[PDB]
Amino acid sequence: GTGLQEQQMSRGDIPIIVDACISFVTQHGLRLEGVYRKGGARARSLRLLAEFRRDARSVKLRPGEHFVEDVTDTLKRFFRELDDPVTSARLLPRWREAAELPQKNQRLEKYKDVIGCLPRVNRRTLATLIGHLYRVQKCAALNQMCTRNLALLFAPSVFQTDGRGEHEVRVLQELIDGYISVFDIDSDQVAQIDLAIRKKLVIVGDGACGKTCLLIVNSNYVADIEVDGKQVELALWDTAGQEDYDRLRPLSYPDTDVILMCFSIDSPDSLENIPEKWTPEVKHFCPNVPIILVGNKKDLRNDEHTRRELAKMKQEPVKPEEGRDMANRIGAFGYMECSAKTKDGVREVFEMATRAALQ
Numbered sequence: 001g002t003g004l005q006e007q008q009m010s011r012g013d014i015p016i017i018v019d020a021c022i023s024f025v026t027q028h029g030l031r032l033e034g035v036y037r038k039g040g041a042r043a044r045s046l047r048l049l050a051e052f053r054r055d056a057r058s059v060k061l062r063p064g065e066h067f068v069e070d071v072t073d074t075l076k077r078f079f080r081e082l083d084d085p086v087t088s089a090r091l092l093p094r095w096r097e098a099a100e101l102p103q104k105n106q107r108l109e110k111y112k113d114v115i116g117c118l119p120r121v122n123r124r125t126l127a128t129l130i131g132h133l134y135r136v137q138k139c140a141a142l143n144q145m146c147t148r149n150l151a152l153l154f155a156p157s158v159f160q161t162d163g164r165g166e167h168e169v170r171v172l173q174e175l176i177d178g179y180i181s182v183f184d185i186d187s188d189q190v191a192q193i194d195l196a197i198r199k200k201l202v203i204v205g206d207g208a209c210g211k212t213c214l215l216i217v218n219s220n221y222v223a224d225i226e227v228d229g230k231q232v233e234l235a236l237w238d239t240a241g242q243e244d245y246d247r248l249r250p251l252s253y254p255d256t257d258v259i260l261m262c263f264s265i266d267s268p269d270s271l272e273n274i275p276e277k278w279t280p281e282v283k284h285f286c287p288n289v290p291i292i293l294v295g296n297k298k299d300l301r302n303d304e305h306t307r308r309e310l311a312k313m314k315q316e317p318v319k320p321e322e323g324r325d326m327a328n329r330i331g332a333f334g335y336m337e338c339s340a341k342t343k344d345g346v347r348e349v350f351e352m353a354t355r356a357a358l359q
Ligand SMILES: Nc1nc2c(ncn2[C@@H]2O[C@H](COP(=O)(O)OP(=O)(O)O)[C@@H](O)[C@H]2O)c(=O)[nH]1
Pocket: 205, 206, 207, 208, 209, 210, 211, 212, 213, 214, 241, 296, 297, 298, 299, 300, 338, 339, 340, 341, 342
């Protein structure tokens, strides 16, 4: 193997895995809302990564055949699993020092100096990645991925941080925003680019499937709920859906009394990750804790735009019976659908969770 120097290299002297994923996402993904925030179905996307590891130049990514979210996941996993972060562990002191200078122009010039000390393959790979993220955020009116969000999603794999690394998020954000300057992009490329009872609740589920909005519309938070005569102080613990936070998420699990396990009705992949990812993790850290399987964004089930996007990959919104079958398959206490956006079903979600916690 997973070393940067051991990879099959493109004509451009960067790893083919990086070149191929970035090219595909650039062609077919710059409009996808939540690109790089949403993830693919675990087993399917890990197969694609394994193909790239076996023989990267043999993988031909084709629209309609490969999921954008599998490819974005593959790119992040590539950087996360390098023996050494592409930014170099040995230069992390200089990165941090650069990040603490007072004025942005001074930080950019220092970042430029650090990048200059990297090995050639690292520099060219980092340049290609940052230029890609620069293009992504320029399309944020469509994909909703501003520079700050991309930096939060990419800093853990790029720098190989624990998951909370504050200096590295600033660097990445400023590298993206300052891409043209830091990487000496000439004016021709600039033009070409222009074209009494207390109970603990934890919520888990795929990135962007609506966990935080569900906690917010109802309300670490606290909600006071009354069910069956009993007044309950429900402690709400929010968690991140991305793989990058897998090491930090178990901090939230101790003492949990009920789990909200979420998928989005507009994402069959997020339902498929219920048995593949969330159920094994939750049953390992929260044995014998009741699970409410929650289908979020119910308002999108018959939404025309949603139905058209999923049909491109021969998918359709999750049906109520599919969620119920899944709830039975994993041994959930119950199944419930809701829309944080319209508030429909939100009370029923937390009332069922509270009854589960009290049984
Ligand atoms: N249509 C619709 N969109 C939603 C709903 N809930 C959340 N969203 C959107 O989905 C995106 C991610 O939501 P968020 O709760 O932050 O996702 P989280 O990553 O799981 O915490 C945001 O753009 C929300 O506005 C919903 O019930 N209906």
